[PDB]
């Protein structure tokens, strides 16, 4: 039934190889936050030569299955990975921090095996407004996963972009009300904050 959903971008990938090879292509891997990014600010991707490959609802396991077709075969200079939100959501099954982290490491190793540079990013803050303990538990699980990612990134000299620290508001780490409406997906103002951070990091890598 095409569990990884390679069908979603199969035709779009064909149209890209037909348009030729591009200089300094950046592919964005992620879920609805990344898919909605292109839908909400098409100019940011069009004007900069960025290619969005987000699919809503997907986990880091889906991203690993799509990595070769949706990243490697597009011969990009750089890949931006944002993964973990739906792993934690458990819409596809029980969360396992070690499995999620391992999927990210597998994607990094596939990218480096193909001379594709990597930028790792933080799982975004997430609203769990049932009560205060629910929000704290959600925030603690996100920080715990991001801690694994940042330690791996530092150890392997991979840039890490910390969306979380700039978008999570006190006291319990809820996604800032200025940056969201549903507490999960950024608004355009929220995306503008992420764009400044990731563009600075991309430009440093691409030189």
């Amino acid at each position: 039934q095409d569990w990884g959903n390679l069908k979603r971008y199969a035709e779009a990938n064909k149209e890209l190889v037909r348009k030729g090879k591009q200089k300094d292509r950046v592919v964005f891997m992620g879920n609805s936050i990344t898919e909605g990014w292109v839908a909400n600010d098409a100019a940011f991707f069009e004007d900069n030569g960025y290619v969005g490959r987000g699919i809503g609802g997907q986990t880091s396991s889906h991203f690993l299955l799509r990595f070769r077709e949706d990243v490697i075969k597009l011969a990009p200079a750089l890949v931006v990975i944002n993964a973990g939100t739906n792993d934690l959501k458990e819409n596809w099954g029980a969360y396992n921090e070690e499995y999620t982290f391992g999927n990210i490491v597998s994607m990094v190793e596939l990218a480096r095996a193909n001379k594709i540079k990597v930028i790792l990013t933080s799982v975004l803050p997430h609203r769990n407004a049932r009560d205060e303990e629910d929000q704290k538990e959600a925030t603690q699980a996100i920080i715990n996963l991001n801690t694994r990612i940042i330690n791996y990134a530092i150890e392997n000299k991979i840039p890490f972009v910390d969306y979380f620290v700039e978008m999570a508001q006190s006291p319990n780490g809820d996604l800032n009300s200025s940056y969201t409406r549903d507490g999960v997906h950024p608004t355009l103002e929220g995306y503008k904050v992420m764009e400044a951070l990731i563009k600075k990091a991309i430009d440093k890598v691409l030189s």
């Epitope: 921090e97 603690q140 715990n144 530092i154 780490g173």
Partner: antibody
Framework: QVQLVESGGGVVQPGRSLRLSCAAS????????MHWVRQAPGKGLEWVAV????????YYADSVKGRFTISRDNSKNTLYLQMNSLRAEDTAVYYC??????????????????????WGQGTLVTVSS | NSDIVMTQSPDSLAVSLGERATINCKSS??????????LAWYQQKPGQPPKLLIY???TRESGVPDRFSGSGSGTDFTLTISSLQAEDVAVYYC?????????FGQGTVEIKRT
């Protein structure tokens, strides 16, 4: 092996100040949060303060807030506790303690810490005239 | 007010040498998160600093003898000494580090005799 050596303790007049130091060795000090914990005579252990690996975040026990300042020098592998306006109830053996977690992200004051995997020998602070 | 409270009930226990010592610790709220128990045990002899005995509720630190074991989850935890040795007479601390401030509970093991 991991060593933590505290110094700076002694008898100090109420109201005065005192600076404790904790010299660390045997581990990459700059990548771990560090803690101060104290034990008053005949009492249990009371956590005092934590400082993140990069010194960006510091949190304190309510009992010392506004009077104590935790700091670190990662180039010297040394942790400090600056104690101001000392009171008789601050009398205790003060321990520095290493946090078990690598580069913990202490973005908020309530987040999980590690367990305290290594402790110093302690330095006695006696606040008395 | 929101600090997690650690309590040992009873807070003192007299155990005959050679017999089983069981120390119970209770937290005011669950300290288990993502299948991990944020509960540590420490031993302190007089004039000595505390020493880590058990971490993640049930993992012995290197060098700790086999007669020490920890168990429990959620709000109820136990430190067991299968056969009490004279060198095991000490103060014992249970510690949660699930939330800041990390907090400790205290109890003593003493030798029972006639």
């Amino acid at each position: 092996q991991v060593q933590l050596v505290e110094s700076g303790g002694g008898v100090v007049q109420p109201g005065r100040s005192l600076r404790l130091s904790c010299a660390a060795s045997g581990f990459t000090f700059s990548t771990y949060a560090m803690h101060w914990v104290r034990q008053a005579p005949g009492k249990g252990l009371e956590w005092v303060a934590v400082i993140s690996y990069d010194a960006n975040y510091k949190y304190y026990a309510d009992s010392v807030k506004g009077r104590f300042t935790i700091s670190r020098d990662n180039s010297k592998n040394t942790l400090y506790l600056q104690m101001n306006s000392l009171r008789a109830e601050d009398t205790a053996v003060y321990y520095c303690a290493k946090d078990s977690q690598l580069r913990s992200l202490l973005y908020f004051e309530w987040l999980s810490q590690g367990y305290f995997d290594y402790w110093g020998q302690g330095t006695l602070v006696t606040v008395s005239s | 007010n929101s600090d997690i409270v650690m309590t040992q009930s009873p807070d003192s226990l007299a155990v005959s040498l050679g017999e089983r010592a069981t120390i119970n610790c209770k937290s005011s709220q669950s300290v288990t998160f993502n299948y991990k128990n944020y509960l540590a045990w420490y031993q302190q002899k007089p004039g000595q600093p505390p020493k880590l005995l058990i971490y993640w509720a049930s993992t012995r630190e290197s060098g700790v003898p086999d007669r020490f074991s920890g168990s429990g989850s959620g709000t109820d935890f136990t430190l067991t000494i299968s056969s009490l040795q004279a060198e095991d007479v000490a103060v014992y601390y249970c510690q949660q580090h699930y939330r800041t401030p990390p907090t400790f509970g205290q109890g003593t093991v003493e030798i029972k005799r006639t």
